[PDB]
Amino acid sequence: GSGVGHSTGDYNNRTEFIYHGDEVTIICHSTRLVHINMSDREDYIIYETDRGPLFPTTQDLQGRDTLNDSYHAKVETPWKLLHANSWGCWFSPADFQQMITTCRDIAPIQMHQKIENIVIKTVSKTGTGETETTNYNNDLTALLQIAQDNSNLLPWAADNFYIDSVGYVPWRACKLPTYCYHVDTWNTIDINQADTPNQWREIKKGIQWDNIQFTPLETMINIDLLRTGDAWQSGNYTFHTKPTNLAYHWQSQRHTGSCHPTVAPLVERGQGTNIQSVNCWQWGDRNNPSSASTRVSNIHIGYSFPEWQIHYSTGGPVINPGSAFSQAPWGSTTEGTRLTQGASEKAIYDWSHGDDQPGARETWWQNNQHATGQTDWAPKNAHTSELNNNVPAATHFWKNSYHNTFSPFTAVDDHGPQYPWGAIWGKYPDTTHKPMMSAHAPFLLHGPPGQLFVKLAPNYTDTLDNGGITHPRIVTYGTFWWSGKLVFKGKLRTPRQWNTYNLPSLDKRETMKNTVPNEVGHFELPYMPGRCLPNYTL
Amino acid sequence: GSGVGHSTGDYNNRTEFIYHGDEVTIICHSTRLVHINMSDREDYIIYETDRGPLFPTTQDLQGRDTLNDSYHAKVETPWKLLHANSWGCWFSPADFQQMITTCRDIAPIQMHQKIENIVIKTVSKTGTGETETTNYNNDLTALLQIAQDNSNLLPWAADNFYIDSVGYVPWRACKLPTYCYHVDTWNTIDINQADTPNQWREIKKGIQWDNIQFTPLETMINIDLLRTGDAWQSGNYTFHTKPTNLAYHWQSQRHTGSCHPTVAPLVERGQGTNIQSVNCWQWGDRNNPSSASTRVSNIHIGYSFPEWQIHYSTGGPVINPGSAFSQAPWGSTTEGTRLTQGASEKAIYDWSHGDDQPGARETWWQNNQHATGQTDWAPKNAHTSELNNNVPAATHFWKNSYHNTFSPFTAVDDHGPQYPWGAIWGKYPDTTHKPMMSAHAPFLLHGPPGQLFVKLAPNYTDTLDNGGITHPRIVTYGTFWWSGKLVFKGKLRTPRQWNTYNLPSLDKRETMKNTVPNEVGHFELPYMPGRCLPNYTL
Amino acid sequence: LAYHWQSQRHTGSCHPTVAPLVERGQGTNIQSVNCWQWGDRNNPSSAST
């Protein structure tokens, strides 16, 4: 039957691996209990923000300190945003290890999700003083309102870049972030000035009101009102995208192609000698020496970029990313000297997302340490005027430059999936030129999965006056159960080598006992890269 | 109809005996009211334990005291475990007497079970001081969550070895034990040392974290959420096993086969004489005397074992059991001198399980007193070098040894069913060599009946912060009605003798009035062995 | 193809304990519990026997 006293759903959180020849189908189930409470206000608001912490108020650091600007302007809505976009939502640590061990590449296929077992109740404080008593009792007639945005009419806020998502741990309750989106504002800081150098000045700062766009959800999309006995279905969503490679590439531009002819060593621990005179294609007008350094090739692996590039835009300063690569060949190590140069990134996360203790935030800095073939770091490169049998002069050689060598010839490679905290998918901008590849999320989508908004309908007291001054409402909160199923498909991996692999494990910075629960139940999900095993590029 | 105000089930607790020729079908119904309340925490935890009471802290007893170690390490789950495995759950004292009187052997056939009439309510204390008032009022929207583990993915904790099961008395309410299972830990105590004798020392003690296995129920199996109006069905389960014999065997190795030729007595109370010269098969090179002691036989009944064998394992010291037999032929008696040697066992039980008074635990030590044919006790056996017409010398005779005589020739026999407290079934380990027979439960199963887990879903207050520090929840408890039906089949027993039997009664240690209720309602279920009647072995 | 780490004291229902209240605290075995013990022994009723 159906009604107040019948449950509308069940709890399924588990994964399935379906193997058929050269094909893997992964079916991820996720079910979470979501704790929601009444909105801070029933109105939309639009407000400017302060600069932020550590933004310079003085000229003493002469502009180098202005990277700290968080200033912006938003429209905050009463709605809460619920998305599953992250790897740690769908997979357990052992499930993700199973995937990245046994698969070559993978892509998401289809997704649907549900909301059910809706409970709403009110708080009544009769304590009337010290030793106060509160009562939590059901409102059987009360509304949870749900809006799925399928056509993507609303601005896109679910990118998982603030790591605000449904929790990673299945047996813990979750809370949603409030939905809000930017409005048009000019923030322009001038750190390079003609008249007065070593200064910074703001030219245009403020909200641009003339063309401003304000979109409520009420006008754009249909909203479903639900009571305690009814439930909600998403419908089916089908991804259209390309698989992402689960193998890291170690080969640089000198690890590919036919290797230079050599004379093999006669003894043990002896080294071969490069034959001096060989048939070769050389760059430039050069036969002597004909070396592996200069020889033609069809492609180039990696490109230099000015890094870290700080783009001062109309909205404020940003980072323009370079390509992902490991600084390990140059002597970088997590402990000791850290070289951030590889388009490295850090995650900040709390107890709700893969963190050990409550009330604190933990940081994981990922240097991308397995990708060593792509590493191109501009201060280390050089260029010379003539390439020939002569060695260049002091002039006609330029050591220290920073340039962008991205060209038609460059083959490059992205970050790939990052467990737990990485976003699974992202959204293309609509522009005449779409980006060629993503800087974080492995999958860029034209239509991304529709954004799902959740709100408690207001329960007013009897005193609402229609004049606007008094609209009290009784304190209300709710809980519902969110279920979802995401399907992946990929290619089966088989050994390409004689010797054994290093199968995906735990980063040296992690130990196994911190992964499992504690005496008080505290544990943290380990980091794993989506690409833990090598393969040949070309 | 269905809803808040319709009952989902009925109470049936009664047995049925179906007789057809040479076949008995016993259908046991059991229905119990289970009182459940909110978990101590919503998280999994993993913790070490102390040694235990009476474990030595000093060398004064020089290691003999270290048998008292209870040290171990577990993972405790919020779930509660509900199993019916015990004899006293399914049978009343008169039903079990009916079975063991009228049946030769028996085996369980099929089983199913139900949960229904679910009630959940909360506690509200408004007393605000002395003369405090509490209110118990329903939450119509609240969830009991139920997980049946059919494929046996979770570790097996329902063996009834701690006698934690559904109650024996049908009209009393029951409470479930919390589910938890071991984790890998090394406990190794050295009581025999080369350098320093008469000492004890611990070599390796602690949790082994590297390979540790942590399995939540959420990831392994589907969980069903139920509200007050819906009910739960188990599905059918079919046992695959062998019948167990309900007759005890009194014949030793000298009570079987053709008896020695004798000359019958001429008068009353006269005794026969063994004929000196007879045709015989003798062991060894021996014709004189040809005696019933030495004559060949195809099999041997019983085997000696070092007892009590204390195995110091990686988890700690254990008992390695010997075969079950009665010490009565050697002068053992419940009152007076007690000889524990027969693989005897004691049950510790409380008011919820077959005990007279609340707030105390009662002990029943079962010497297995009807099995006298299997009794082989190593200190009493001897061995000699030569078996011939000569009597051995002082040398070439060894009296006091303790050895394991289990051989290809030994025929032996197990404990059998023990009412009320004995486990009905058990689980095989998966190993290359499965055990040949069970030391307690009459029936070992490959897949045992699936474990059934029960938990109250948490009811949070409005203050859950997602940070992890504050997650209060309103005090909640519930009650549900558990029904189950277990079917047995067996063989009908008929008289094999002229004289009357001793039909199963009450052990001399029990009297009838302690079995029936008291002025205040206190009574205890009597002990009965599953094998109360003799039969010929061979 | 799987090795087994469980000894005779790593199998079955574990002894009833009181969970620790703090971090790095250890639980205590409950002294008086319902149990099947070997021999004629109630005191102590321990996971060993």
CSV table of N, CA and C in Angstrom, one decimal, chain B residues 193-287:
chain,number,residue,atom,x,y,z
B,193,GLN,N,60.1,-22.3,27.6
B,193,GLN,CA,61.2,-21.5,27.1
B,193,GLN,C,62.5,-22.2,27.4
B,194,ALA,N,63.5,-22.1,26.5
B,194,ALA,CA,64.8,-22.7,26.6
B,194,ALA,C,65.6,-22.1,27.7
B,195,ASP,N,65.7,-20.8,27.7
B,195,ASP,CA,66.6,-20.2,28.7
B,195,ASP,C,66.1,-20.2,30.1
B,196,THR,N,64.8,-19.8,30.3
B,196,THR,CA,64.3,-19.6,31.6
B,196,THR,C,63.0,-20.4,31.8
B,197,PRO,N,63.1,-21.6,32.3
B,197,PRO,CA,61.9,-22.5,32.5
B,197,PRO,C,61.0,-22.0,33.6
B,198,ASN,N,59.8,-22.5,33.6
B,198,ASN,CA,58.8,-22.1,34.6
B,198,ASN,C,58.5,-20.6,34.6
B,199,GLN,N,58.5,-20.1,33.4
B,199,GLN,CA,58.1,-18.7,33.1
B,199,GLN,C,57.1,-18.7,32.0
B,200,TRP,N,56.5,-17.5,31.8
B,200,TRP,CA,55.6,-17.3,30.6
B,200,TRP,C,56.0,-15.9,30.1
B,201,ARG,N,55.9,-15.8,28.8
B,201,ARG,CA,56.3,-14.5,28.1
B,201,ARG,C,55.5,-14.4,26.8
B,202,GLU,N,55.1,-13.2,26.5
B,202,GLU,CA,54.3,-13.0,25.3
B,202,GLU,C,55.3,-12.5,24.2
B,203,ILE,N,55.2,-13.1,23.1
B,203,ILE,CA,56.1,-12.8,22.0
B,203,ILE,C,55.5,-11.7,21.1
B,204,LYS,N,54.4,-12.1,20.4
B,204,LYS,CA,53.8,-11.1,19.6
B,204,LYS,C,52.4,-10.9,20.0
B,205,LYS,N,52.0,-9.6,20.3
B,205,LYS,CA,50.7,-9.3,20.8
B,205,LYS,C,50.3,-8.0,20.1
B,206,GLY,N,49.2,-8.0,19.4
B,206,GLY,CA,48.7,-6.8,18.8
B,206,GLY,C,47.9,-7.1,17.5
B,207,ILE,N,47.3,-6.0,17.0
B,207,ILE,CA,46.5,-6.1,15.8
B,207,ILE,C,47.5,-6.1,14.6
B,208,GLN,N,47.2,-6.9,13.6
B,208,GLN,CA,48.0,-6.9,12.4
B,208,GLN,C,47.3,-6.0,11.4
B,209,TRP,N,47.9,-4.8,11.1
B,209,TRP,CA,47.1,-3.8,10.4
B,209,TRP,C,47.3,-3.9,8.9
B,210,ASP,N,48.3,-4.6,8.4
B,210,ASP,CA,48.7,-4.5,7.0
B,210,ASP,C,47.6,-5.1,6.1
B,211,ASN,N,47.2,-6.4,6.4
B,211,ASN,CA,46.2,-7.1,5.6
B,211,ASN,C,44.8,-7.0,6.2
B,212,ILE,N,44.6,-6.2,7.2
B,212,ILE,CA,43.3,-6.2,7.9
B,212,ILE,C,42.1,-6.1,6.9
B,213,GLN,N,41.0,-6.8,7.2
B,213,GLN,CA,39.8,-6.9,6.5
B,213,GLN,C,38.7,-6.2,7.3
B,214,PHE,N,38.1,-5.2,6.7
B,214,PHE,CA,37.0,-4.5,7.3
B,214,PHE,C,35.8,-4.5,6.3
B,215,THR,N,34.7,-5.1,6.7
B,215,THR,CA,33.6,-5.2,5.8
B,215,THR,C,32.3,-4.6,6.5
B,216,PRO,N,31.8,-3.5,6.0
B,216,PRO,CA,30.5,-3.1,6.5
B,216,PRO,C,29.4,-3.9,5.8
B,217,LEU,N,28.2,-3.9,6.5
B,217,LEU,CA,27.1,-4.5,5.9
B,217,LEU,C,26.5,-3.7,4.7
B,218,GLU,N,26.7,-2.3,4.8
B,218,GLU,CA,26.1,-1.5,3.8
B,218,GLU,C,26.6,-1.8,2.4
B,219,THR,N,27.9,-2.1,2.3
B,219,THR,CA,28.5,-2.3,1.0
B,219,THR,C,28.3,-3.7,0.5
B,220,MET,N,28.1,-4.7,1.4
B,220,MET,CA,28.0,-6.1,1.0
B,220,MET,C,26.6,-6.5,0.5
B,221,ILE,N,25.5,-6.1,1.3
B,221,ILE,CA,24.2,-6.7,1.1
B,221,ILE,C,23.2,-5.6,1.0
B,222,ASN,N,22.0,-5.9,0.4
B,222,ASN,CA,20.9,-5.0,0.3
B,222,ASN,C,20.2,-4.9,1.6
B,223,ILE,N,19.8,-3.7,2.0
B,223,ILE,CA,19.2,-3.4,3.2
B,223,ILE,C,17.8,-2.9,3.0
B,224,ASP,N,16.8,-3.5,3.7
B,224,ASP,CA,15.4,-3.1,3.5
B,224,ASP,C,15.0,-2.2,4.7
B,225,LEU,N,14.4,-1.0,4.3
B,225,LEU,CA,13.9,0.0,5.2
B,225,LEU,C,12.4,-0.2,5.3
B,226,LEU,N,11.9,-0.4,6.5
B,226,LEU,CA,10.5,-0.7,6.8
B,226,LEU,C,9.9,0.4,7.8
B,227,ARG,N,8.7,0.7,7.6
B,227,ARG,CA,7.9,1.6,8.4
B,227,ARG,C,6.9,0.9,9.2
B,228,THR,N,6.0,1.5,9.9
B,228,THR,CA,5.2,0.8,10.8
B,228,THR,C,4.1,-0.1,10.1
B,229,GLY,N,3.8,0.2,8.9
B,229,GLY,CA,2.7,-0.6,8.3
B,229,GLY,C,3.1,-1.7,7.4
B,230,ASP,N,4.3,-1.7,6.8
B,230,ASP,CA,4.9,-2.8,6.0
B,230,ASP,C,5.6,-3.9,6.9
B,231,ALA,N,5.7,-5.0,6.3
B,231,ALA,CA,6.3,-6.2,6.9
B,231,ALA,C,7.4,-6.9,6.0
B,232,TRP,N,8.1,-7.8,6.6
B,232,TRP,CA,9.3,-8.4,5.9
B,232,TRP,C,9.2,-9.9,5.9
B,233,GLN,N,9.5,-10.5,4.8
B,233,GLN,CA,9.5,-12.0,4.5
B,233,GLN,C,11.0,-12.4,4.3
B,234,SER,N,11.3,-13.6,4.8
B,234,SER,CA,12.6,-14.1,4.6
B,234,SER,C,12.8,-14.8,3.2
B,235,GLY,N,11.8,-15.5,2.8
B,235,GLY,CA,12.0,-16.5,1.7
B,235,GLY,C,12.4,-17.9,2.3
B,236,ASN,N,12.4,-18.9,1.4
B,236,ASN,CA,12.6,-20.2,1.9
B,236,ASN,C,14.0,-20.6,1.9
B,237,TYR,N,14.4,-21.4,2.9
B,237,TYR,CA,15.8,-21.9,3.0
B,237,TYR,C,15.7,-23.4,3.2
B,238,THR,N,16.5,-24.1,2.5
B,238,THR,CA,16.5,-25.6,2.5
B,238,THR,C,17.8,-26.1,3.0
B,239,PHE,N,17.8,-26.9,4.1
B,239,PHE,CA,19.0,-27.5,4.6
B,239,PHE,C,19.4,-28.7,3.7
B,240,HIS,N,20.8,-28.8,3.6
B,240,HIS,CA,21.3,-30.0,3.0
B,240,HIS,C,22.3,-30.6,4.0
B,241,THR,N,21.9,-31.8,4.5
B,241,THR,CA,22.7,-32.4,5.6
B,241,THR,C,22.2,-33.8,5.8
B,242,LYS,N,22.8,-34.4,6.8
B,242,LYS,CA,22.5,-35.8,7.1
B,242,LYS,C,21.8,-35.9,8.5
B,243,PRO,N,20.9,-36.9,8.7
B,243,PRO,CA,20.3,-37.1,9.9
B,243,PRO,C,21.3,-37.4,11.1
B,244,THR,N,20.9,-37.1,12.3
B,244,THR,CA,21.7,-37.4,13.5
B,244,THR,C,20.9,-38.4,14.3
B,245,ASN,N,21.7,-39.4,14.9
B,245,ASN,CA,21.1,-40.5,15.6
B,245,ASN,C,20.7,-40.1,17.0
B,246,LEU,N,19.5,-40.4,17.3
B,246,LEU,CA,18.9,-40.1,18.6
B,246,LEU,C,19.0,-41.2,19.7
B,247,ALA,N,19.8,-42.2,19.4
B,247,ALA,CA,20.1,-43.3,20.4
B,247,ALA,C,21.5,-43.2,20.8
B,248,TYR,N,21.7,-43.4,22.1
B,248,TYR,CA,23.1,-43.5,22.6
B,248,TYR,C,23.6,-44.9,22.5
B,249,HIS,N,24.9,-45.1,22.4
B,249,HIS,CA,25.5,-46.4,22.2
B,249,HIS,C,26.3,-46.8,23.5
B,250,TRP,N,26.0,-47.9,24.1
B,250,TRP,CA,26.6,-48.4,25.3
B,250,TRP,C,27.7,-49.4,25.0
B,251,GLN,N,27.8,-49.9,23.8
B,251,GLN,CA,28.7,-51.0,23.5
B,251,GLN,C,30.1,-50.5,23.3
B,252,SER,N,31.1,-51.1,24.1
B,252,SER,CA,32.5,-50.8,23.9
B,252,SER,C,33.1,-51.8,22.9
B,253,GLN,N,34.4,-51.8,22.7
B,253,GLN,CA,35.0,-52.7,21.8
B,253,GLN,C,34.8,-54.2,22.3
B,254,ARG,N,34.7,-54.4,23.6
B,254,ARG,CA,34.4,-55.8,24.1
B,254,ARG,C,32.9,-56.1,24.2
B,255,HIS,N,32.0,-55.2,23.9
B,255,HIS,CA,30.6,-55.5,23.8
B,255,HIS,C,30.1,-55.8,22.4
B,256,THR,N,31.0,-55.9,21.4
B,256,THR,CA,30.5,-56.1,20.1
B,256,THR,C,31.1,-57.4,19.6
B,257,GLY,N,30.4,-57.9,18.6
B,257,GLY,CA,30.9,-59.1,17.9
B,257,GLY,C,30.4,-60.4,18.6
B,258,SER,N,31.0,-61.5,18.1
B,258,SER,CA,30.7,-62.8,18.8
B,258,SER,C,31.4,-62.9,20.1
B,259,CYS,N,30.7,-63.2,21.1
B,259,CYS,CA,31.3,-63.3,22.5
B,259,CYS,C,32.0,-64.6,22.7
B,260,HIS,N,32.9,-64.6,23.6
B,260,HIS,CA,33.8,-65.7,23.9
B,260,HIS,C,33.0,-67.0,24.2
B,261,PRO,N,33.3,-68.2,23.8
B,261,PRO,CA,32.6,-69.3,24.2
B,261,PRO,C,32.7,-69.7,25.7
B,262,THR,N,31.6,-70.0,26.3
B,262,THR,CA,31.5,-70.2,27.7
B,262,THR,C,30.7,-71.5,28.0
B,263,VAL,N,30.7,-71.9,29.2
B,263,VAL,CA,29.9,-73.0,29.7
B,263,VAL,C,28.9,-72.4,30.6
B,264,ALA,N,27.6,-72.6,30.3
B,264,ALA,CA,26.5,-71.9,31.0
B,264,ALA,C,26.4,-72.4,32.5
B,265,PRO,N,26.0,-71.6,33.4
B,265,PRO,CA,25.9,-72.0,34.8
B,265,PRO,C,24.7,-73.0,35.0
B,266,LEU,N,24.9,-73.9,35.9
B,266,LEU,CA,23.9,-74.9,36.2
B,266,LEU,C,22.9,-74.4,37.2
B,267,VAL,N,23.3,-73.5,38.1
B,267,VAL,CA,22.4,-73.1,39.2
B,267,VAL,C,22.0,-71.6,39.0
B,268,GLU,N,21.3,-71.1,40.0
B,268,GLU,CA,20.9,-69.7,40.0
B,268,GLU,C,22.0,-68.9,40.7
B,269,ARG,N,22.2,-67.7,40.1
B,269,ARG,CA,23.3,-66.8,40.5
B,269,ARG,C,24.6,-67.4,40.4
B,270,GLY,N,24.7,-68.4,39.5
B,270,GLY,CA,26.0,-69.0,39.2
B,270,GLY,C,26.5,-68.3,37.9
B,271,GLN,N,27.8,-68.3,37.8
B,271,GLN,CA,28.5,-67.6,36.6
B,271,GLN,C,29.1,-68.7,35.7
B,272,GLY,N,29.1,-68.4,34.4
B,272,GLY,CA,29.7,-69.3,33.5
B,272,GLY,C,31.2,-69.2,33.5
B,273,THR,N,31.8,-70.2,32.9
B,273,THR,CA,33.3,-70.3,32.8
B,273,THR,C,33.7,-70.2,31.3
B,274,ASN,N,34.7,-69.4,31.0
B,274,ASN,CA,35.2,-69.4,29.7
B,274,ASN,C,36.0,-70.6,29.3
B,275,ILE,N,35.7,-71.2,28.2
B,275,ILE,CA,36.4,-72.4,27.7
B,275,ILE,C,37.8,-72.0,27.4
B,276,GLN,N,38.7,-72.8,27.9
B,276,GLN,CA,40.1,-72.5,27.8
B,276,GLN,C,40.7,-72.6,26.4
B,277,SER,N,40.4,-73.7,25.7
B,277,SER,CA,40.9,-73.9,24.4
B,277,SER,C,39.8,-73.8,23.4
B,278,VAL,N,39.8,-72.8,22.5
B,278,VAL,CA,38.8,-72.5,21.5
B,278,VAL,C,39.5,-72.1,20.2
B,279,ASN,N,38.7,-72.1,19.2
B,279,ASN,CA,39.1,-71.5,17.9
B,279,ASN,C,39.0,-70.0,18.0
B,280,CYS,N,40.1,-69.3,17.6
B,280,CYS,CA,40.0,-67.9,17.7
B,280,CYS,C,41.0,-67.3,16.7
B,281,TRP,N,40.8,-66.0,16.4
B,281,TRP,CA,41.8,-65.1,15.8
B,281,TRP,C,42.3,-64.3,16.9
B,282,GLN,N,43.6,-64.3,17.2
B,282,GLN,CA,44.3,-63.6,18.2
B,282,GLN,C,45.2,-62.5,17.6
B,283,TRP,N,45.4,-61.4,18.3
B,283,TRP,CA,46.4,-60.5,17.9
B,283,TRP,C,47.8,-61.0,18.3
B,284,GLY,N,48.8,-60.6,17.5
B,284,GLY,CA,50.1,-61.0,17.9
B,284,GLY,C,50.4,-62.5,17.7
B,285,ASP,N,51.5,-63.0,18.2
B,285,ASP,CA,51.7,-64.4,18.2
B,285,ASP,C,51.4,-64.9,19.5
B,286,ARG,N,50.1,-65.3,19.7
B,286,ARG,CA,49.6,-65.7,21.0
B,286,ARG,C,48.4,-66.7,20.9
B,287,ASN,N,48.6,-67.9,21.4
B,287,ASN,CA,47.5,-68.8,21.6
B,287,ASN,C,47.1,-68.9,23.1
